[PDB]
Amino acid sequence: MAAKVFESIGKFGLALAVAGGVVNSALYNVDAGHRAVIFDRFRGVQDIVVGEGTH
C-alpha cells in the first residue's frame, strides 16, 4: 500500500538528489578564448586539449 511504495520513494528521493549532484559535478564549462587541459590523478595529464564549450 502506501507504506511500501512511498518508502521506496523515499530512497528514490534521496537517490535522485545524489544522482543529480553527480551529473552536475560531471559537467564543466570552458569559456571562449580559454582551453582546458584535463589531468587525471591516476594517469596524469592527457595530451588532448579541450576547446570552448560544455563537456
State the Rg of the chain over Cα: 19
> In 1-55, where does DSSP find H-type helix?
2-26
C-alpha cell at 34: 580559454
30: exposed, middle or buried (Cβ count in 10 Å: 0-12, 13-18, 19+): middle
Give resolution in angstroms. 16.3
End-to-end CA, the chain: 43
C-alpha cell at 6: 512511498
> Using CA atoms, how far apart are residues 39 and 11, in angstroms rounded to an integer?
34
CA-wise closest residue to 55 among 41, 33, 43, 37: 37
> Using CA atoms, how far apart are residues 8 and 10, in angstroms rounded to an integer?
5
